[PDB]
Each structure stands twice: as C-alpha cells, then as structure tokens.
Amino acid sequence: QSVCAGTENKLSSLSDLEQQYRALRKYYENCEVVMGNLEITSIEHNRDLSFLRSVREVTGYVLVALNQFRYLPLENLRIIRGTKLYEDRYALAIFLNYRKDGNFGLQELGLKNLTEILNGGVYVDQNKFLCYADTIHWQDIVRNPWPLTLVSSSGCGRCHKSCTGRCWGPTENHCQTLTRTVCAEQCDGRCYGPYVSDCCHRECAGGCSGPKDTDCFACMNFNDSGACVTQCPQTFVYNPTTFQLEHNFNAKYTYGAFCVKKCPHNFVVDSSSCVRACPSSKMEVEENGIKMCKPCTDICPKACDGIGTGSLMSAQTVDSSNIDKFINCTKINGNLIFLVTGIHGDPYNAIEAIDPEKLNVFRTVREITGFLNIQSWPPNMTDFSVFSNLVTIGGRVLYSGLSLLILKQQGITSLQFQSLKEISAGNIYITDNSNLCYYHTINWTTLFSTINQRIVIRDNRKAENCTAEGMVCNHLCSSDGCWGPGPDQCLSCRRFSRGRICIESCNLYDGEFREFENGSICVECDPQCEKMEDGLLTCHGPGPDNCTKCSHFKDGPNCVEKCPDGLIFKYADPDRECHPCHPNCTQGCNGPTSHDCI
Amino acid sequence: GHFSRCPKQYKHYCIKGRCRFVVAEQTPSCVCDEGYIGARCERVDLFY
Amino acid sequence: QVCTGTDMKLRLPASPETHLDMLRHLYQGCQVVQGNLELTYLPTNASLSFLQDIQEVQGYVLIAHNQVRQVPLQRLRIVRGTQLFEDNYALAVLDNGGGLRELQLRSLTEILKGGVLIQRNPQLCYQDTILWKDIFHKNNQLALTLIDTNRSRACHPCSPMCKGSRCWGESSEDCQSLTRTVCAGGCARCKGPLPTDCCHEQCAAGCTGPKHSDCLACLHFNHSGICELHCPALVTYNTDTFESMPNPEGRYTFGASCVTACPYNYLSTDVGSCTLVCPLHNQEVTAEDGTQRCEKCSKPCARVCYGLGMEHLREVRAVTSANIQEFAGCKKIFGSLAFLPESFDGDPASNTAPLQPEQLQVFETLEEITGYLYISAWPDSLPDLSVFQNLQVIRGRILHNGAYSLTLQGLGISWLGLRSLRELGSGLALIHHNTHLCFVHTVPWDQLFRNPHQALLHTANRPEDECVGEGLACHQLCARGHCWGPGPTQCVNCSQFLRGQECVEECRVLQGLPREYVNARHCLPCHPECQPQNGSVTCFGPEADQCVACAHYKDPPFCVARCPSIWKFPDEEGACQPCPIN
Ligand SMILES: *[C@@H]1O[C@H](CO)[C@@H](O[C@@H]2O[C@H](CO)[C@@H](O[C@@H]3O[C@H](CO[C@H]4O[C@H](CO)[C@@H](O)[C@H](O)[C@@H]4O)[C@@H](O)[C@H](O[C@H]4O[C@H](CO)[C@@H](O)[C@H](O)[C@@H]4O)[C@@H]3O)[C@H](O)[C@H]2NC(C)=O)[C@H](O)[C@H]1NC(C)=O
Ligand SMILES: *[C@@H]1O[C@H](CO)[C@@H](O[C@@H]2O[C@H](CO)[C@@H](O[C@@H]3O[C@H](CO)[C@@H](O)[C@H](O[C@H]4O[C@H](CO)[C@@H](O)[C@H](O)[C@@H]4O)[C@@H]3O)[C@H](O)[C@H]2NC(C)=O)[C@H](O)[C@H]1NC(C)=O
Ligand SMILES: *[C@@H]1O[C@H](CO)[C@@H](O[C@@H]2O[C@H](CO)[C@@H](O[C@@H]3O[C@H](CO[C@H]4O[C@H](CO)[C@@H](O)[C@H](O)[C@@H]4O)[C@@H](O)[C@H](O)[C@@H]3O)[C@H](O)[C@H]2NC(C)=O)[C@H](O)[C@H]1NC(C)=O
Ligand SMILES: *[C@@H]1O[C@H](CO)[C@@H](O[C@@H]2O[C@H](CO)[C@@H](O[C@@H]3O[C@H](CO)[C@@H](O)[C@H](O)[C@@H]3O)[C@H](O)[C@H]2NC(C)=O)[C@H](O)[C@H]1NC(C)=O
Ligand SMILES: *[C@@H]1O[C@H](CO)[C@@H](O[C@@H]2O[C@H](CO)[C@@H](O[C@@H]3O[C@H](CO)[C@@H](O)[C@H](O)[C@@H]3O)[C@H](O)[C@H]2NC(C)=O)[C@H](O)[C@H]1NC(C)=O
Ligand SMILES: *[C@@H]1O[C@H](CO)[C@@H](O[C@@H]2O[C@H](CO)[C@@H](O[C@@H]3O[C@H](CO)[C@@H](O)[C@H](O)[C@@H]3O)[C@H](O)[C@H]2NC(C)=O)[C@H](O)[C@H]1NC(C)=O
Ligand SMILES: *[C@@H]1O[C@H](CO)[C@@H](O[C@@H]2O[C@H](CO)[C@@H](O[C@@H]3O[C@H](CO)[C@@H](O)[C@H](O)[C@@H]3O)[C@H](O)[C@H]2NC(C)=O)[C@H](O)[C@H]1NC(C)=O
Ligand SMILES: *[C@@H]1O[C@H](CO)[C@@H](O[C@@H]2O[C@H](CO)[C@@H](O[C@@H]3O[C@H](CO)[C@@H](O)[C@H](O)[C@@H]3O)[C@H](O)[C@H]2NC(C)=O)[C@H](O)[C@H]1NC(C)=O
Ligand SMILES: *[C@@H]1O[C@H](CO)[C@@H](O[C@@H]2O[C@H](CO)[C@@H](O)[C@H](O)[C@H]2NC(C)=O)[C@H](O)[C@H]1NC(C)=O
Ligand SMILES: *[C@@H]1O[C@H](CO)[C@@H](O[C@@H]2O[C@H](CO)[C@@H](O)[C@H](O)[C@H]2NC(C)=O)[C@H](O)[C@H]1NC(C)=O
Ligand SMILES: *[C@@H]1O[C@H](CO)[C@@H](O)[C@H](O)[C@H]1NC(C)=O
Ligand SMILES: *[C@@H]1O[C@H](CO)[C@@H](O)[C@H](O)[C@H]1NC(C)=O
Ligand SMILES: *[C@@H]1O[C@H](CO)[C@@H](O)[C@H](O)[C@H]1NC(C)=O
C-alpha cells in the first residue's frame, strides 16, 4: 500500500539545502502512508513539492516549520493518528514559515480532505504571510477536546458567501465540511448530513459515503478486508442463550492494524494474534516449524531488555550505564545498537564511555530478536571477539529494510563470528570499512532465510589489494564462509571438523585420545577400552560397545575396566567377562560356587 | 533570522554538527555535518 | 435480581402443593428471567404479586391452563424469544378458562423473533385489539399472529380516550402506545411522530432520550446502564508495537450483560466470558478459594468422566446395567445422574438388566456432580443412599425440569445419609412422598444453600412428631441437634471428638484399651512400641519422636521390636547398645 518511514529529526537538518530537498523526495515521493512522523522543513520557494500529494495518512505527528514556499500540496491528507506528538503535546504543528527580512513564506494550507486527529493538540502561532489561520472549527477535527489550538496575514477575505466561517483558503473549494458538530442527537460517530437517516457507522473515521462499516474513508481500530472493526474474527463465539463458548469457522489473526489469514513466519502466533515477543507469563515454543507460545507451567527462560523495549524505552544505544543490564543474558528482546554517544560517552548527559572490557557482558548472548546497528566501536577492538558465539539475529524488527548495518568501522580488520549461521529476515548494508579484509569471502545466500533478501557492499578495503599483500583464507576452509585467519574462523570446511575447529584428519588410529567419524564430524570414544596400532580403527562409535579392542574384561555387549561388584555380588575374571556370584556370597565373593563366599 | 548562538548548557547538545538556538520558539536545534542525521546529528545517513 | 425458568412447556407440576412456593422463591424480587418464562396451571386467586418485577425474558413467555383472572406483568418491556414455544412462538396464551380476563401487558414493546399465538380462552377480552406489527422488530418481522376471537364473554369498548381502539384491558390506562409505525424516520423504535424522536441504533422498546444511555431495553449487551455491542476484552492488542497486554478497562461477558466478575457457580474463561462448560482442550482449575477457571492443556488432556446429558450420553434416559460401569472409580462427573423406574427394574425390549446394589458401588469415589441428582426409584433393601456417602458438592449447572438440583420422589428410604455433602451450589431441593424418611427436619439446609432464590420444598414425607414419636431422632453428642440419620455416625459436627466416622465423648488416653493421643477433634493410638504408661506424652503422639517410654528394645531415638543386627543388643534398662560381635 505504498508505506514509507518518516525522518524523525524535529527542527535539525543537513548543512546542504539541496540534499535536504532530495532526501525529502527519497523518503516521501509517491508514498501514501507515513510510518512515524511526517516532517516537512526548510524548503525554499524555488523547489516543487507535488510528490507529497499522494499522502493519505500519518501515524505520528505532522510538522511543518521554517519554509519559504507559498502552498502546502497536502490536499489528500485525511487523518493524523497521533501515536507520537511534537514536544509530547501537539499532533499537528505549522509555524514560522517565512523570511524575517523579506516577502517569502507560506500563504495557503490546502488540506481539502483533512477531517480528523485522533490524539494530541494543534499548534499554529506565528506565520507572517499565512492567510485563513483563524476561522476554522477545530472542534470538528479534534476527537478529544481540551477546553492547545493556538492561532495568531489578515484581511484575506472568505472562501465563499455560502461558507459561514468554515474556511482555510480564498475559494469555495477551501471550505471546512463539518462531520461531528453537525449531526443527529442519536449519533455516536460522524455524519454525511444533518439527519438521523444520513449518519454513518461507529468505527468509521474521516467521514463516510454510506451507513455501512465498509463505506468509510478511514478506520478506527482494525481493517477487516475493507470493513472498519473493533476486533478481528476470533477462534470462538460466545452464545448468550446457553452460557457456552462455541468454536468459530472464519477466525483470523489480529496483526498490526489488520486482520489476516496467514501470520508472518518470524512472529509468535498466539491463539488469535501475531506479536514481536510473547508476554512474560507465557513460554515461547516451536511445533512443526511454527513459532508460538504456551502458559509458563515449567521453569521458563527469560529474554533481556533491548534498546527501545522493556525498561530501555528511552535508550538510543548501549551506554556505560545500561550495559550492566546484559550480564547473565542469552537472548535480547529488542534491538542492539552502538551509537557514537553510547561508545564515546555523551558530555551533554551524565553518561560516560564504555571500557572495552565491559563489552564482555554480551559473550553469553545467542539470539537478538531485533536488528544490529553498529556505527561505533572501541579503537583497538579489531574483530568481534564479543558475540563470536551469536547464533541468529532479527526477523521481527528491522532498521528501515536492514537486519545488519555496519558503517565506517576503521579499527576492524576481520569479523570472526563462529556461531552466526542464519538471519531470520532483512537486508545487509556494509560500507566504508577501509581496513576490513574478509568481507568478500562470504556466500550470503547461505545466511539469508529467503531468496528475496539482498546485501550492499561498497567503499571497504579493496579485496584484491588485501589478498595479494594482506590477509588470506585458510587452506582447509571452503569458498563459502571464510571470515578470518585460522581454521577456527571458517563457517564451512572441507574434510573434517571438531566443534568450532577444522582439521585435515581425525584421531581414529593414532593419538593419546581416539575418535569415530561421520562425513565431516569426529567425536571421541570411551577411553576405558584399548588403543589400536598400525592404522587400525580403535572404535565404531561413542562407547565401550563400539571399541574394536578391550584391554580388560567385558560385561555382556561392552568393554569394562572395573566390574560393578557388591551391588548382591557379581565377580569378574581379568581376561573375558563379569559373572554373577553364588547366592550365599553376602560378605565378599571369589567365584560362582558355594566355597567362593566370604 | 529566527535563531542565534546556543546558551552555555548546550555546549555539547549536538554531536558532529553546528549547534544553533531558535529564539522564536526558545528551542535548540543543530545543522548536521555531511553524512549525519538525527535531532543531535548522532547518526549516519544510509542514503549518502 | 437475576432468576431462571423451568422450560417444561405444558407438563403438569411434579408437586402441585409446592408449585406456587417454587414460583415465588425463583421470581420474587428479580428483574431478568434467563431462559423461558412459564406460568402454567395456576389455581383460582393465586398470589402472583411477586411477578410484578419482571422486565425482560430471554426465552418465550407461556401462560397456559390457569384459573387466575389477571397476571401482574405490566412492567414486562421485552421478550428476546431465543427459544420458541413449539419452535414457533415467543408469546403463547392457551386454554386459560373463571379464566384470564385481560392481558394487562402495558409496557410490552418488543418481540425480536418468533410469532405470537392465542387460542381457546373464553373469558379473555381484547385479543384482537393490539397492533402486533408495532411490537415486532423490523429486521425479523416474524408475525405469524394466529388469533381466536371465539370468546363467551361480551367485550366493552376498551376506552373513551383511545383514538385507535387498541388496548390491553378494560381501563383508560390500557391503551397501546405505538413506537414504530407512527414516526417520520426509518428507526426501529422512536418516542414520538417527529424526525427528532428517533432514539438510537442499539436501543429497543423506545427510550427516555436520544443516547445509548436512555434505552428502555437494549440490543447486544447492557454495560453498567449504557447499551453496548460487545463487552470490553480482558486483553488488548497494541496495533503500533505489535504486542498483547492486559486491558485496564477489560470485562467479562455474561448472557445479556457485561460484568467485572462472574457469579459463584460460573466457570471463567480467559477470552472474556463466563460459561457452564469448559472449552475443548482445557482443565477446570480452582485457582482461588470460592472460584473456578479454565486453563489450556500443555499436553493431551486426561479422560473426562461424563454423566447424563453430555457427549455420548445426551440421549440416555437414566443410568442402567448397560452403562453403570462408565462411572467406575470417577471422582468428578461431567453431567447429571438419574435413577428412575426401569433403572432398577428391567427393560426386556432392549435386553437390559436392572441395576444391582453391587453395581451402585462405582460411585464410592465420587465427590462432585456438575449437574443434578434425580432419584425416583431405589431398592427396598437399602434404607439410605450410602452408595453416595462421599459426595461433597452438587453444582446445579444442569437442573431437573430446569429448577431442581436434588430431587427425591416417593423412595423407600428410612434416612438420607450422605454425610460428606457440604454444598448445593445452585438449584432447588425437592423432597416429597418419601414415606419412611424423617431426618429431613434435622438437616442444616441453611448451611448447604449458596444463593438467594434458593430453598427446600417438601410434602408427604413422614411427619416429624409421628416419627420422632418413636424416639427416632438426632444424636445428642453433635451439631446442636443436626443429623443425617440415626446414631453418632450420622452426626454433622461432633461437640467432643470423632473416632473414625463416630462422634465419641472420650479420647481414650489413659483407659485400659490401647491408649490414644489427642488431636483437635480426633483420637488415635500410640505406635505399638510406645509404652502405655499413665503420663500424657509417654506413649502418645502421631510420631515415634513423642514415644519417650519404651516397652522393649529401646533404640535411643525410638522404641523398636528388636535391636538391629553394626550389631546392637538390649542393656540392663532395656535399651539397644553396640555388640562386641558383628
Ligand atoms: C550472573 O549473576 C550472578 C548473580 O545472580 C553473579 O554472581 C555469582 O557469580 C559467581 C562467580 O561467577 C557464580 O559462581 C560461583 O562463584 C563462587 C564464588 O564464591 C562465593 O560463593 C560460594 C558459594 O558456595 C561461597 O562458598 C564463597 O564463600 C563465596 O561467597 C565459586 O565458589 C563457585 O565455583 C568454585 O567453587 C565451587 C565450590 O563447590 C567449586 O565446585 C568450583 O569448581 C569452583 O572452584 C562458582 O564459580 C555464582 O553462582 C553467582 N551467584 C549467584 C547467586 O548466581 C554471576 O557472576 C553472573 N554471571 C556472569 C557470567 O556474570
Ligand atoms: C480528496 O477529496 C476528493 C473530493 O474532494 C475525494 O473524492 C474522490 O474523487 C475521486 C475522483 O475524483 C473518486 O474516484 C472514483 O473512481 C472510481 C473508479 O476508479 C469511480 O467509479 C468513482 O465514481 C463514482 O463513485 C464514487 C464513490 O466513491 C464517487 O465519489 C464519484 O463521485 C462517482 O459517483 C469515482 O470517480 C473517489 O471515489 C472520491 N472519493 C470517494 C471515496 O468518494 C478524495 O477521495 C479525497 N482523497 C482522499 C483523502 O481520499
Ligand atoms: C556405537 O556405534 C554405532 C554405530 O557404529 C551406533 O549405532 C547404532 O545405534 C542404534 C540405535 O541406538 C542401535 O540399535 C538399533 O538400530 C537399528 C537401526 O536403526 C537406526 O536407524 C533408525 C532410523 O533413523 C533409528 O531410529 C535408530 O535409532 C538407528 O539409528 C534399529 O532398527 C533398531 O531398532 C535399534 O535401535 C545399533 O545397534 C547401533 N549400532 C551398533 C552398536 O551395532 C551405536 O549407538 C553406538 N553405541 C553407543 C554407545 O551409542
Ligand atoms: C482496508 O484494506 C484494504 C486492503 O486489504 C484496502 O484496499 C486497498 O487499498 C489500497 C491502498 O493503497 C489500494 O491500492 C491502490 O491501488 C491502485 C491501483 O490502481 C494504485 O493506483 C494506488 O497507488 C494504490 O496502490 C487497493 O487498490 C485497495 N484494494 C481494493 C480491493 O480496494 C482498503 O483501502 C483498506 N481500508 C481502509 C479504510 O484503510
Ligand atoms: C553459494 O550458495 C548457493 C546457495 O545459497 C549455492 O547454490 C546452490 O548450489 C547447489 C549445488 O549445485 C544447487 O543444488 C543442486 O545443484 C545441481 C547441480 O550441481 C542441480 O542438478 C540440482 O537441481 C540442484 O539445483 C542449488 O540449487 C543452488 N542454489 C541456488 C539458490 O541456486 C552456490 O553453489 C554457492 N556458491 C559457492 C561458490 O559455494
Ligand atoms: C553421526 O551421525 C548421527 C546421525 O546419523 C549423529 O547423531 C544425530 O545428531 C543430531 C544432531 O547433530 C540429532 O538431531 C537432533 O537431535 C535432538 C535430540 O533431542 C532432536 O530433538 C532433534 O529433533 C534432532 O533429531 C540426531 O537425533 C542424532 N541422531 C541419532 C540417531 O541420535 C551423530 O552425532 C554423528 N556423529 C558424529 C561423530 O558426528
Ligand atoms: C442496565 O442494568 C441496570 C441494572 O444492572 C439497570 O439499572 C437498574 O434499574 C432499576 C430500575 O429499572 C433499579 O431498580 C430500582 O431502584 C430504586 C432505587 O431507589 C428502587 O426505588 C426501585 O424499587 C427499584 O429497585 C436498579 O437500582 C438499577 N440498577 C443500577 C445498577 O443502577 C439499567 O436500567 C440497565 N440499562 C439498560 C439500558 O437496560
Ligand atoms: C460445630 O461446627 C463449628 C464450625 O462450624 C465448630 O468450630 C468452632 O469450635 C470452637 C470450639 O468448640 C467454638 O468455640 C470457640 O472455641 C475456642 C477454642 O479455643 C475459644 O477460644 C472461643 O472462645 C470459643 O469458645 C467456635 O465457636 C466454633 N465456631 C463456629 C463457627 O461455630 C464447633 O466446634 C462445632 N460445634 C459443635 C457443637 O459440634
Ligand atoms: C372460530 O369459530 C369459527 C366458526 O364459528 C371457526 O371458523 C370455521 O372454521 C371451520 C373449520 O372447519 C370451517 O369449516 C368454517 O367454514 C368456518 N366458518 C366460517 C364462518 O368461516 C374458526 O375456525 C374458529 N377459530 C379458531 C381460531 O379456532
Ligand atoms: C500406672 O499404670 C500402671 C499400670 O500400667 C499401674 O500399675 C498397676 O498397679 C496395680 C495396683 O493395684 C497393680 O495391681 C499392677 O500390678 C500394676 N501394674 C504394673 C504393670 O506394675 C500404676 O498404678 C499406674 N500409676 C498411677 C499413678 O495410676
Ligand atoms: C584501547 O582503547 C581503550 C578505550 O578505553 C583505552 O583505554 C586504551 O588505551 C586503548 N589501548 C591502546 C593500546 O591504545
Ligand atoms: C595494498 O594496500 C596498501 C595500502 O597502503 C598499498 O600501499 C599497496 O600498494 C597495496 N598493494 C597492492 C598489491 O595493491
Ligand atoms: C376467590 O376469591 C373469591 C372472592 O369473592 C371467592 O368467591 C372464591 O371462592 C375464591 N376462590 C377460592 C378458590 O378460594
């Protein structure tokens, strides 16, 4: 549905005004729904804004500030949901749009279809050249009145003689159409006329075309396939005639703003809803490849707060103060970020830099449910010795389109991740790593979960330059996944391996320890049995029953060094086997017969 | 214009950018150096 | 208050002598009738004033075979008709003939579903007068409306001031007020002819104003005096952060209304509603004292022991020799139990034997029935119901004839027994014709009931003074004179001690027989090794540790039969010491 993300900058901008305009296009050009805020700032009267005409809805606040152009082409903007407010008060804020020492600034607002704000106030205040800032019935637009709405050009006239103070422009097409304050007494919602017979449905937002829950220009609550609804179809229906709960046949997942028939694979299916993590009262489980959750009846594992989740909602980064919360963690619920301010401290705040030794609290983490954003790292941390045992990342939360973001890391020469095998979803962006050597030796379609994932690599250390006179891949490592120097930095080896270590041959017929093998993995056999010489195999598998030779007696199918006598007694000969003792042998045994008992 | 120099309590308000203080709304803001974004210019631009 | 109905159509009362007491206790003081409202076979001059409080009926309204001149339902505003008389009608008035004179349904303003029907009422005037299509609901319009004007009385004009001659009776106040067919707008109900007199989408029966707070009756659910589409869920889903969390405003759905919590006898479900059955793949868990809820099974659920009216037993008449084995060793039964003629007699047509006293032993482990217990036949060899002596709770979720949780009809019982019983969660108790039982008067009924609209009804059981005239009466040791039957084993609560099942006056501590240690209401023997001295600790306690006195071979922590073979031997004081030989 042409969904795009906002800039989230507030008043701050780039030093290059032309790049600021190009970026405004890159973010919002041809978009219909804005995620987070819609921020339109510092654009000169010499640049066209017609690419903003397709925007229908904004989840955050709409901010327009310090511009020089005459008209806002925001004619199709219908609804502002107010999930985030400017200065934590205002959902719409339009101010200071003019040059102090000239004749340039905003004159007309457009917005012909702007009907409602669900949360937050309105800020207008000073706009030197703006006509019709006043004479708007803001109580028909705001759904929650606060008896906010601050207004301060004059003598601009009226839209039309027929529009009785319901105007935000110079023509009859700029007249405010009242949908809440001009209604029947019986209405709970908004109307399409002044009668009880032309009032519309209760979930509908932004005006209506008819009385049906389908006939509506926006929805409160959920979209169920074009119907505005308070709740999606549930797996059960309550029967008030018999006090019974009956099973449904048309149930759907409650998911974001929508009702859907197929939950996203990376999300927990709870019984009728899809969520980024299961609540703390329930344990996350997997059945038949489906990620789901059940009541915590057993001793349940707990995930730790990530950046922007749990007790860290206000955190931008790991920092010298919140790094102490990750000490015993194996899973992080949320994102993992390292900004400049977190790593080198923030002198505006009481936060200090992080000592590289403090980073060791993450050496126990195997899963991160959000994305990895790395923009700063300590000057002498040349590889990721922390997180080397990290298994999987992302799937549920992404940074724009990315699950792994690595920007401008000058101190890094190798990555050295040993356990990182899969990325659940999202793309990869790695650039400006001028000293990083092994980035070209990875077959990334082996790490991606779907054929639709992509990676962008540019401006890092030249691969031919490093290979020729720098660092190269280990002789035993394959063409897929050679992340650093040595046999222990390779994700996929030829011949054999033992855990994280790659080897040319296994200890089957030589060494102070002996092993058995499969196609590429070797494991040690029970040492209580004998070691074979002259190239001969010592064991067929992990036990005294597999050992090919035994230096001691046996017990049934397997080699035994010491016989479990004195259980009941069960003696043994030194050459062949253990045997049961005579029934009278209660205080020692020398054999199976009557004279062997002590 | 609408802004002047940042008050002493904002010496470190902005990182990798030029700090300015908006007089009309009595509110600090920053002009970021090339390749930096965010309210304090605390992040790099992925489209650069 | 909230009350329920019988759902017995035109059948005869089980105990006509208590028929009016049953109706007065179930309905006196209640505003809402759950299920059908049935007022049948009422005698001449019945005191029906307790019915004046009924505002709303969930099922059909049936008035049949009554000799009463009037029935005080003038406040009844709405019939939901969710069950229909003969699967057709939401109101039925049948054979009331000296008979019913006037309907007097002043405030009746809604039939949502199902027809009206009227037949064979020779004394009932003004059938013909009411404009049924104003009372019907627009979206259903199910006005079958069969009528029978062939009355024996002559009707007077209903009122000098009723412009349409449409009335509920002979009074100037009986004139029908119209609420649908007289208004300019398209609204299902309105308060006046004007386009501004429409009151609301969710309101029914008309209104006192234009808001969902003004409704005289309410579609969907009443929440707290405002009329509403659904009761708010207990858990709310966050559409912006994709997470589920408890709802600060969350509520339970309960029949016609929305509540903060459900009544004592209802089973809570986490979806936001209260039911009488637990959804598939869930256990009934008593998480807190006085309540119960459903919880999901983490692995496949255990066997559920079902009774009559549930699953494969839904069409089964009674317990017989063909199905008695299904209850063998059950502690909780999901459903009801019925022991009728042809349960203890035979049924040659289906080749089924009668129940035997040995077969009744399957219920010895039973503690709870999630329904009713109905017994109308029993063996003559059993003077009591001791095969259920361990039954503790009767929930009443399913009631016999829609009203009774416990019913005993004409049995050969000499005393009730059932000493383990402590709760009758819901439903009435009916005891009558039981020609040889008498301890019904000593039972502490006020301790067993849990809700108002709940009572004992009884008649034709052997008279107290005629029966206690034989000295057959409750035991003096116990319970202020409350008993289940004869003797100190049929006591409710011992004033001194309980030994086994018997109330006892003495705790046998220092007597000639095997000496007992004391407990708060109980008495139990020393361990056999503890010496029966006359000192109150010596021999006495629940453990070896109290038995400081030893009869023989004393091991320092406790007296034992023999010193253990490290080998030990008895010394000069009878205590165990290590041997020189091992
Ligand atoms: C996760 O969070 C916990 C807090 O919940 C942190 O705190 C403890 O950290 C220690 C060290 O990592 C954990 O491990 C144990 O530490 C003992 C230290 O001695 C103290 O505790 C013992 C307990 O019996 C006392 O007798 C003693 O007087 C001290 O007060 C070690 O003794 C343990 O191992 C050694 O001793 C045992 C003795 O049987 C030997 O078997 C071992 O071979 C070895 O010689 C052990 O290392 C401790 O469990 C944590 N406590 C709790 C309550 O959880 C953790 O540090 C933190 N984890 C990480 C990774 O940061
Ligand atoms: C912004 O404001 C405008 C009005 O100021 C608002 O109206 C939309 O206009 C367009 C055309 O200009 C309508 O487009 C429809 O297109 C279909 C085919 O694609 C036609 O079949 C429609 O014809 C009829 O039915 C419509 C019923 O929705 C009528 O609106 C129309 O007059 C015809 O009788 C029609 O041309 C579009 O439907 C309307 N909007 C609606 C839903 O009425 C526009 O929607 C506003 N933008 C925003 C914020 O959505
Ligand atoms: C010693 O080394 C052996 C290999 O050299 C190990 O392998 C074998 O393990 C099985 C299972 O424990 C033993 O038992 C039987 O195996 C057969 C074969 O079925 C196999 O495949 C099916 C299908 O996947 C699988 O379900 C089984 O587990 C087996 O892996 C079965 O049909 C029988 O029912 C039975 O399970 C073998 O006897 C055993 N091989 C030997 C020793 O002969 C063996 O496990 C190693 N021992 C130790 C100490 O673990
Ligand atoms: C409720 O959800 C449904 C989808 O399940 C919404 O319907 C769809 O709305 C999208 C909005 O972008 C329409 O896409 C448009 O398609 C035209 C094709 O010519 C394209 O030019 C536009 O750029 C845009 O992509 C889509 O056609 C439409 N689908 C149908 C079948 O109508 C619906 O709008 C939602 N309702 C509300 C109130 O949110
Ligand atoms: C980089 O990794 C990709 C997988 O992400 C490797 O591509 C895969 O190669 C295998 C082996 O050839 C393909 O499987 C089978 O190949 C035979 C031909 O050898 C063919 O007859 C079978 O029908 C089957 O395709 C597999 O399809 C292919 N995957 C994809 C997505 O194309 C690739 O070889 C790796 N490159 C290096 C240098 O290791
Ligand atoms: C030689 O190959 C055998 C298999 O033929 C290896 O044993 C297998 O090890 C895998 C893990 O690498 C086991 O898979 C998983 O096991 C867990 C056990 O709880 C189960 O929950 C998972 O669903 C999955 O099955 C597999 O079961 C196991 N096979 C058997 C038969 O036990 C063996 O380790 C190899 N030896 C060497 C030296 O590498
Ligand atoms: C929603 O249900 C509530 C009850 O839960 C309804 O309110 C109840 O209205 C009755 C009258 O119809 C009240 O009873 C009367 O109270 C006065 C108190 O002085 C007494 O004099 C009368 O004899 C009679 O007992 C009752 O108190 C009241 N309950 C509450 C909780 O206020 C309400 O009408 C229902 N709303 C709809 C739209 O149906
Ligand atoms: C019948 O049942 C009640 C419980 O329903 C029995 O429990 C309670 O027992 C005590 C002792 O007999 C009664 O009196 C109080 O005893 C304590 C003993 O320390 C004393 O401190 C008090 O001053 C008082 O005397 C208590 O009232 C009673 N509670 C109730 C709820 O009745 C009772 O023992 C049984 N009675 C018979 C006659 O079986
Ligand atoms: C009311 O009584 C009349 C007769 O007084 C009944 O109408 C007759 O019904 C019989 C049914 O077999 C017909 O054969 C006659 O032709 C009818 N008579 C007339 C004059 O139409 C009527 O059925 C009774 N009403 C009810 C509801 O029982
Ligand atoms: C403690 O109880 C013992 C019995 O266990 C009493 O001893 C008995 O006393 C009678 C007195 O006539 C003798 O005939 C018996 O031979 C005694 N029995 C034993 C086993 O010695 C003793 O009197 C009791 N003590 C008190 C104070 O009552
Ligand atoms: C490594 O960086 C840390 C950062 O805290 C610093 O303290 C240390 O001096 C650095 N080491 C070297 C050798 O520069
Ligand atoms: C490799 O990189 C260094 C960077 O200083 C450069 O001087 C050298 O010429 C390069 N070598 C090759 C083989 O390109
Ligand atoms: C009903 O009361 C009237 C009062 O006049 C009386 O004549 C009649 O006998 C009464 N009926 C009964 C059954 O008591």
Residue numbers in the entry:
A (entry chain A): 26 to 172, 175 to 179, 183 to 597, 604 to 634
B (entry chain C): 64 to 111
C (entry chain B): 24 to 120, 135 to 602, 613 to 629
Copied sentences from the primary study:
We used this set of interface mutations to enrich for the fraction of functional HER2-G778D-V956R/HER4-I712Q heterodimers in large-scale purification for structural studies. We present here the first cryo-EM reconstructions of both the homodimer and heterodimer complexes of the HER4 receptor in its full-length form, bound to two different high-affinity HER4 cognate growth factors, NRG1β and BTC. This is also the first time that a betacellulin growth factor has been resolved bound to a HER receptor. Despite the diverse sequences of the NRG1β and BTC ligands, the larger-scale domain conformation of the HER2/HER4 heterodimers stabilized by each ligand is identical with only small differences in the ligand binding pockets. However, we attribute the lower resolution to variability in data collection on GO grids, rather than differences in conformational heterogeneity of HER2/HER4/BTC. Extensive 3D variability and 3D classification analysis of the HER2/HER4/NRG1β and HER2/HER4/BTC datasets did not reveal any defined conformational heterogeneity within domains IV or dimerization arm regions. N-linked glycosylation is also resolved in the cryo-EM maps of the HER2/HER4 heterodimers (NRG1β and BTC bound), with HER4 glycosylation patterns being the same as seen in homodimers.
Here, we report cryo-EM structures of near full-length HER2/HER4 heterodimers and full-length HER4 homodimers bound to NRG1β and BTC.
